[PDB]
């Protein structure tokens, strides 16, 4: 083995797993949700049509993403 | 370096893992033979005897 060749495997490992995390963060199966589980506003047609199964409306999701932005 | 007529192919395992199979023409033609230089000192010290 040559250290560029261990480094290559390390790199493809370092991105394959990151990609699988970010691709598992998106859902496709049908558990049809029709009301924001955080507030109660109706999740619109375009939103719920871009991701079948989005449990939350857009603004509540943005708030959640920020709360995660501070990691806790 | 020097440009020489490489040819990419497996040749009887004499270029197996990362080896190289140099021709004797490349030795005859004095291609890569380089000059190195060495200082060697010899000091005349003053021993206690």
């Amino acid at each position: 083995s040559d250290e560029a060749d261990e480094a290559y495997s390390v790199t493809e490992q370092l991105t394959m797993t990151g990609i699988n995390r970010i691709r598992q963060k998106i859902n496709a199966h049908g558990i049809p949700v029709y009301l924001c589980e955080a507030c109660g506003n109706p999740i619109p047609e375009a939103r719920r049509k871009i991701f079948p199964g989005v449990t939350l409306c857009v603004e509540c999701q943005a708030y959640q993403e920020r709360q995660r932005k501070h990691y806790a | 370096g020097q440009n020489m007529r490489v040819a990419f192919m497996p040749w009887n395992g004499y270029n197996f893992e990362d080896s190289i199979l140099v021709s004797e023409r490349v030795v005859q033609e004095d291609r890569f033979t380089t000059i190195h230089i060495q200082e060697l000192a010899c000091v005349s010290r003053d021993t206690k005897l």
Partner: protein
């Protein structure tokens, strides 16, 4: 010569006993006559002569007067090697505390006095007087008394106080301590005063007092009164050419001590005041402490340059110390190193060693051989001859190289195959030609890798080379029996390309008289190298019990397969070479050759399989060219569609349909999908793209594209790395791991703009910076392993136990992920294996499972075999042959002596190279008991089946009884049919939970009509049908296979009314139509009418962290952060004082002492109730269980199967393999200490920590007697903590913290009967493992006889 290594404190009369004089002056040499000036730290009078047999002034210089002391200067005339053995001693004017017994893990000076260490450091620095049994009328002994209240006491009691200070205080105190009465009173008033921390700290201190009285020391010996000086040549004062001098820093620290001591002597003589003298003694303390170890105390004395000094304790302690850097790791004569080259012509059992290296390596050999041959009179003349290199020496050399193997060893010796004994072939040139097949074992490529040669000198060293370490005996890895001689890159491509098949080449269709005719055709140009031909071949098979029966037939093979068949030996079948022969197929070929034909035939076949591969690769002309990495045609349309999808998602983010994080996640997903599509496009375009002409019209076949040939044969490359030359190299990951949201849509055949390259260089540097750092983490898990498992050795034949881990295949939902064959291959059965009807035994008990026994077992398909394990072994001090198993570098059972401990350590350490460096991550409910039905978060409705169906997802089903408490609670999945309803109290047998799980329901919400909106067959859905019912079924044409016509349209079933208008949803101003995920076959077609809860379709439906540290995390036995609590005792559980800070929890058996209490913190979830009669060693909550409770609760066969599995998982994750013989041997050494819970009737205390082999042999003799043994609880330790607690102290001092493993061992008077591999390696005698095992046995028998 010596048998053990006793260690202890040294009494000041002892320290005088060592010396030969007393150092007084601080002077070393004379600056003009480099004689050592008496009598400093280099002094001929105190430390013996300087030149061999000669007084200093020269009065005597002969072997005549050897033994006489020169009257002039008193220097003894003897050898000057005596300078390394004589010691001095500095008579301190002030007692001074040994810093080791003061500032340590527990302060041995402290808790031997049970005085807090701050108080001791104060009384030593002269900060405070302290009483030493002055008179106990008012005050007690330890009472620290500062100056004010002390002068009070002088008022109070002018006498009867004696109030001493400094080190004299502590010495007078220790002399005033009694140990018999102290230990009596301590043990008794710890039995009388029984608390939780109290008695345990008291028992530690009482164990200290016990050890101190048991041994030979005295408590005051910790306070130095005489200080010994090293001999003068262990701290040289060498001259550097140029008048400079090289000095050990001991010469500096000893000189500082002597300066301070002489000044203090003058001070005491001169009657100086209080402050000058007390400061002086406090400062002599500092010099003594620095001379013992520098930075252990406050300040590190630095010398001439500002680096700190390497004092005495640092000459032993550390990687730069005597133990690590010198005692195990010496330099070596008769050895060299050089670059290595290939040498494709060598046999498997030899190495090309150059003449100029073989002539300087083997000089003594040739000198003696010439003096024998009469070619030189002397050794001086022979030296001249071999120096001028006459022809006779070049023949005498290869006469001495005749049967002399040399060891070849590469740089990081990871596993034992990194050192192998080859037979030299004298070579012109300067590089060591090393066989191509051992490059894999060595982990050696020829990028300038330098290998190192050693020579075995002693005749038995030569026989160990030839008979164990030879290269032709190591063709199977020990970490798993599979070969290590697998042909790597040119050989595999040569065999592949040779043993492949065209469709219409030259010479296709011939029938051949055998393989020789095929070869005569290929070397004559008539047939192609791959040309389908019917050749008659003759295979020999050993159907008989060792008889080769022939069988000849007409095989449909190619010219290559026939040409390569004559390199296969007889016993193999012809079905081994009828295939393209990838690297996997080749390794199977070689492995079954090993299994059937032995080792000699395979060791021939291993290099005939290589010569022919090399030759038919040279013939192939296989090259690589820029027209060979073919860009697919579906690339630009693919990345176009993907970029258009990105654009539409971007615009939707502009509108406010998605957040920034979610648009990012969608963009990453769509680019990942497009990269998948591109790789599949170029692969499908490349692999098969060779279409050809038959004879015949046209056909298709696997392509001869070279970049694909070297990748499909496994020789070099893969479908991934080829993707970056033809396909696109995907999305580039930042060093954090957060992927960048813009891909490198280009490849390496096309260029790359600057930003596309600069983006990729991020991960390209993270990966390289990690593999460049991962060096010193892999060779450190292995050091811990080989020290915890150093002293283990197969040291008997059969313990005769009936106990072993029940090996069952490690399935994860379906077919096994690792069959029973390789998980039981080689280990020995601990029970008879009975046929699945238990009729009678497939295999008896003491049965080594071979390949043949293992397949005779598997053919009848057993699923559980009780095999023996080192962990449940039975040998005292070692391991028995059978309980370990079969071997792995040798096919047979292990021979008694095989140091399996180090083998296990290395089998688990060297695959660690391949592991990652940093961590990373990846059919109903039947009621049991009484209670009423209750739930929450529920949102259901009655369906056309009449039931109740929860539309919600997280709602739970509780079984609450009439008292109000919970009795059962079960998760209620999405869309459940609740036969019963809410609230009605239920008894057993009433399953309120039922469904069809595998179909992910798409249950209805509204009640109205059915139609198909945006549903098209051929584009968005399939017009499918299943003939089982004959009624057509609608499957959505999934995007991964559906047509690109409606690729961006959304099929769905819409809910309407009979009039033809939409049916809104409750409270939502939007219709109720369900867009259908693909692979959802909808039952209900058009025109039907349904109400809520109607499952309209069917849908088909874990995080193991895997870094290397997860291995060291597991082997250290660490308690995770949310450890699942276990039902510590059988019997029913019940709640108590709820939230006493945390909640109370108690398990009360059916009969036993019930009140077992448990603090279950209420913030964490529970999974038990007040009416559950749970069984022992079982969870109550859940989460990562700590391994301690597993071993402690369930059983030692449950700690292993926990450890053995959870670390096997980390290896199968990255793709490694080990045998689980190698983890169970490290588990045994970890769980290798037990705590006595009951003293029983043998000689142990109620909470003592003793080795299990010690507590076992002792009581086993007693239960062999009439008396009783003891009951213990097996403890558990980490691979580091379990090793620091070892019988030997030389064995522990070498590995980890040395000043503590030593200083504790001193006070303990501990002896060391050095048996074990490391202790013997330190002291330069034979191992107790291999060829040294037998020698240690007779010495063990002439010991004790």
């Amino acid at each position: 010569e010596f048998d053990a290594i006793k260690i202890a404190l040294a009494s000041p009369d002892m320290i005088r006993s060592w010396s030969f004089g007393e150092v007084k002056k601080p002077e070393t040499i004379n600056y003009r006559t480099f004689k050592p000036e008496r009598d400093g730290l280099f002094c001929a009078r105190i430390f013996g002569p300087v030149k061999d047999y000669e007084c200093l002034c020269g009065k005597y210089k002969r072997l005549k007067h050897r033994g006489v002391i020169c009257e002039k200067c008193g220097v003894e005339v003897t050898q000057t090697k005596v300078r390394r053995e004589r010691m001095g001693h500095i008579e301190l004017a002030s007692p001074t505390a040994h810093i080791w017994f003061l500032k340590s893990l527990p302060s041995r000076i402290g808790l031997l006095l049970d005085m807090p260490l701050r108080d001791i450091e104060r009384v030593l620095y002269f900060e405070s007087y302290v009483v030493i049994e002055g008179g106990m009328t008012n005050l007690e002994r330890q009472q620290i008394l500062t100056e004010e209240q002390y002068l009070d006491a002088l008022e109070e009691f002018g006498d009867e106080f004696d109030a001493k200070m400094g080190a004299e205080a502590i010495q007078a105190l220790l002399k005033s301590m009694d140990l018999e009465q102290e230990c009596e009173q301590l043990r008794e008033e710890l039995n009388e005063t029984n608390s939780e921390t109290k008695r345990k700290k008291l028992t530690k201190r009482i164990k200290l007092l016990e050890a101190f009285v048991q041994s030979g020391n005295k408590p005051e010996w910790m306070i130095l009164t005489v200080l010994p000086v090293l001999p003068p040549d262990l701290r040289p004062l060498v001259p550097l050419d140029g008048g400079r001098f090289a000095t050990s820093d001991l010469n500096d620290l000893y000189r500082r001590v002597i300066n301070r001591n002489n000044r203090l002597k003058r001070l005491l003589d001169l009657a100086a005041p209080d402050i000058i003298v007390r400061n002086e003694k406090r400062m002599l303390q500092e010099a003594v402490d620095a001379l013992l170890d520098n930075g252990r105390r406050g300040r590190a004395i630095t010398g001439s340059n500002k680096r700190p000094l390497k004092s005495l304790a640092d000459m032993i302690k550390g990687k730069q110390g005597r133990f690590r850097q010198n005692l195990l790791g010496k330099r070596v004569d008769y050895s060299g190193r050089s670059v290595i080259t290939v040498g494709p012509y060598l046999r498997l059992h030899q190495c090309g060693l150059p003449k100029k290296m073989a002539l300087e390596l083997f000089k003594p050999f040739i000198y003696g051989k010439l003096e024998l041959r009469g070619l030189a009179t002397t050794i001086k003349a022979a030296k001249k001859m071999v120096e001028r290199e006459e022809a006779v020496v070049w023949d005498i050399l290869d006469e001495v190289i005749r049967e002399h193997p040399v060891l070849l060893n590469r740089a990081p010796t990871l596993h034992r195959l990194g050192i192998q004994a080859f037979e030299p072939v004298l070579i012109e040139g300067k590089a060591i030609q090393l066989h191509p097949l051992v490059c894999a074992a060595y982990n050696a490529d020829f990028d300038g890798d330098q290998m190192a040669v050693h020579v075995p000198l002693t005749l038995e060293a030569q026989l160990e080379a030839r008979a164990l370490m030879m290269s032709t005996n190591n063709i199977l890895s020990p970490a798993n029996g599979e070969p290590i001689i697998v042909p790597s890159q040119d050989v595999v491509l040569g065999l592949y390309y040779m043993t492949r098949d065209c469709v219409n080449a030259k010479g296709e269709g011939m029938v051949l008289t055998g393989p020789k005719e095929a070869e005569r055709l290929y070397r004559s140009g008539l047939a192609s190298l791959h040309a389908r031909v019917k050749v008659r071949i003759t295979e020999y098979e050993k159907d008989a019990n060792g008889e080769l029966v022939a069988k000849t037939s007409l095989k449909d093979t190619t010219v290559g397969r026939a040409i390569l068949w004559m390199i296969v030996p007889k016993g193999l079948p012809y079905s081994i070479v009828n295939q393209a022969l990838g690297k996997k197929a080749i390794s199977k070929m070689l492995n079954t050759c090993y299994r059937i034909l032995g080792l000699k035939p395979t060791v021939i076949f291993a290099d005939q399989i290589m010569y022919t591969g090399f030759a038919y690769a040279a013939r192939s002309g296989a090259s690589v060219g820029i027209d060979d990495m073919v860009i697919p045609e579906k690339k630009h349309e693919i990345i176009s569609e993907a970029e258009a999808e990105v654009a539409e998602i971007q615009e939707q983010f502009q509108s406010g349909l998605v957040t920034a994080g979610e648009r990012y996640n969608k963009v990453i997903d769509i680019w990942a999908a497009a990269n998948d599509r591109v790789s599949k496009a170029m692969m499908d375009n490349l692999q098969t793209e060779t279409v050809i002409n038959r004879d015949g019209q046209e056909e298709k076949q696997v392509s001869f594209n070279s970049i694909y040939m070297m990748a499909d044969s496994g020789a070099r490359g893969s479908a991934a790395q080829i993707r970056q030359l033809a396909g696109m190299r995907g999305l580039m990951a930042k060093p954090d791991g957060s992927i960048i949201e813009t891909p490198i849509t280009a490849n390496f055949r096309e260029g790359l703009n600057v930003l596309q390259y600069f983006i990729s260089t991020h991960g390209a540097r993270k990966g390289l910076a990690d593999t460049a750092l991962k060096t010193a983490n892999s060779g450190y898990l292995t050091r811990r392993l080989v020290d915890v498992a150093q002293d283990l050795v197969v040291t008997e034949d059969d313990c005769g136990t009936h106990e072993g881990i029940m090996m069952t295949p490690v399935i994860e939902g379906g077919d096994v992920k690792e069959p029973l064959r390789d998980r039981v291959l080689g280990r020995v059965t601990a029970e008879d294996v009975l046929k699945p009807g238990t009729a009678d035994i497939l295999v008896p008990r003491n049965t080594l499972l071979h390949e043949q026994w293992c397949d005779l077992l598997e053919e009848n398909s057993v699923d559980a075999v009780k095999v023996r394990s080192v962990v449940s072994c039975d040998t005292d001090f070692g391991v028995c042959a059978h309980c370990y198993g079969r071997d792995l570098a040798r096919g047979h059972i292990i021979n008694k002596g095989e140091a399996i401990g180090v083998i296990a350590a290395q089998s688990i350490g060297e695959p660690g190279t391949q592991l990652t460096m940093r961590t990373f991550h990846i059919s109903s409910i039947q009621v049991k008991n009484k209670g009423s039905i209750k739930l929450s978060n529920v949102k259901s409705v009655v369906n056309s089946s009449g039931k109740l169906v929860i539309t919600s997802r997280n709602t739970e089903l509780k079984l609450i009884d009439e008292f109000g408490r919970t009795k059962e609670s079960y998760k209620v999945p999405y869309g459940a049919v609740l036969a019963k309803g809410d609230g009605e109290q239920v008894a057993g047998g009433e399953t309120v939970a039922n469904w069809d799980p595998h179909t992910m329901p798409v249950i209805t919400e509204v009640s109205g009509f059915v139609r198909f909106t945006d549903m098209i067959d051929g584009q968005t859905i399939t017009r499918q049908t299943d003939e089982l019912t004959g009624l057509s079924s609608l499957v959505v044409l999934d995007s991964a296979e559906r047509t690109a016509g409606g690729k961006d349209l959304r099929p769905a079933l819409k809910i309407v009314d009979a009039q033809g208008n939409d049916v809104l949803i409750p409270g939502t101003d939007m219709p109720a139509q369900y867009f259908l995920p693909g692979k959802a076959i909808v039952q209900l077609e058009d025109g039907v009418q349904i109400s809520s809860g109607d499952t309209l379709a069917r849908i088909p439906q874990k995080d193991i962290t895997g870094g290397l540290p997860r291995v060291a995390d597991l082997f250290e036995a660490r308690r995770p952060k949310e450890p699942a609590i276990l039902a510590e005792i059988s019997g029913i559980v019940s709640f108590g004082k709820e939230t006493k800070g945390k909640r109370r929890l108690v398990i009360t058996p059916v009969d036993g002492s019930d009140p077992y209490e448990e603090m279950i913190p209420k913030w964490r979830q529970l999974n038990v109730f007040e009416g559950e009669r749970v069984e022992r060693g079982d969870v109550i909550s859940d989460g990562p269980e700590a391994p301690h409770d597993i071993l402690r609760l369930r059983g030692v066969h449950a700690v292993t199967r926990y450890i053995v599995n959870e670390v096997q998982d980390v290896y199968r994750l990255q793709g490694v393999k080990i045998n689980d013989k190698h983890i169970e041997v490290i588990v045994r050494q970890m769980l290798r200490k037990a705590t006595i819970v009951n003293a029983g009737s043998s000689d142990f205390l109620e909470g003592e920590q003793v080795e299990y082999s010690r507590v076992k042999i002792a009581n086993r003799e007693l239960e062999a007697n009439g008396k009783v043994g003891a009951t213990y609880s097996r403890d558990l330790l980490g691979i580091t903590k379990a090793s620091l607690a070892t019988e030997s102290f030389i064995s522990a001092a070498s590995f980890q913290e040395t000043t503590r493993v030593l200083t504790e061992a001193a006070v303990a008077g501990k002896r060391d009967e050095l048996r074990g591999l490391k202790e013997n390696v330190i002291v330069g005698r034979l191992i107790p493992a291999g060829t040294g095992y037998a020698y240690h046995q007779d010495r063990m028998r002439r010991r004790a006889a």
